[PDB]
Every structure is written in structure tokens, then in C-alpha cells.
């Protein structure tokens, strides 16, 4: 029932994501010089360095907020992909599966801890 435990759990999950080769297209903001129309399609760019920096600045109050930003990385990749002939989108799907598999217990433990706190 540790209400703060999610933060270090998210830091470790981000470390595993950065070592994963599938995170390569998502480690830094999408390069607007490489994709000049990117902002005509994507309203809110998001990437794993931004998520890590937001976490380390103490600007996430809960792991649900961090989740929303990580899922936005995958949603943006899905919206910007032209077709199946895209290594980036395929990497996004495997990385999303890995993320969801690992974040499930972080979310559950946090929500359980907060329910215990408010008992
Ligand atoms: O169509 C899609 C998703 C689709 C893309 C090809 C692989 C399977 C998933 N996204 N999208 C791009 N432009 N408008 C929407």
C-alpha cells in the first residue's frame, strides 16, 4: 500500500523501454525536419524522453497520467503511419504490448494503495 512506489517502478520500466531496440523511433521528439507535415497530423507530440523528464521533474501526480502520455506516443505513431510497410508502426505495436504488460501491476498497486489510504 505504498502510494509513492509507482514512481520508481515507472523509472525502471522506462529504463527497460530505452534498452529495447523497438523504442528507437520514440526516444526523442519526432524530427520535424525529417517529417515536415508532422504537426499538420499530430496535435500533441510525445516521446519517451519527454515522459522521463516529466516524471523526474515531479510533474506526474499518478502513474495514470504517465500512462496517458505513453499511450499518446503509440496513438501518434498509429495516426502518422501511411501503411503496414512501416517499421516504425510495427515497432510501436510491440513496444505498446511490452508497456501494457508491465504497467498493469503498477496501476493496480497504485489504485489499491490509494483505496487503502482513503478507507
Ligand atoms: O490507418 C491507420 C492505422 C493503420 C495504418 C497501417 C497499418 C495498420 C494500422 N492510421 N492512419 C493513418 N492515416 N490516417 C489514419
What can you see in these coordinates?
It is classed as protein binding. Keywords: SGC - Diamond I04-1 fragment screening, PanDDA, XChemExplorer, Fragment-based drug design, sampl7, protein binding. It forms a monomeric assembly. The protein has 119 residues and is mostly helical. The protein has a single domain, classed as Histone Acetyltransferase, Chain A (Up-down Bundle), CATH 1.20.920. 64% of the residues lie in helices and 0% in strands. It contains 5 helices and no strands. The chain has helices at 6-19, 38-41, 48-56, 63-80, 87-117. α1 (6-19) packs antiparallel against α5 and α4 packs antiparallel against α5 (87-117). It starts with 5 loop residues before the first helix and ends with a helix. 18% of the residues are buried. The structure holds 2-cyclohexyl-N-(4H-1,2,4-triazol-4-yl)acetamide. Residues 78-79, 81, 83-84, 89 line the site of 2-cyclohexyl-N-(4H-1,2,4-triazol-4-yl)acetamide.
Gist of the model:
This protein has 119 residues and is mainly α. The chain has helices spanning 6-19, 38-41, 48-56, 63-80, 87-117.
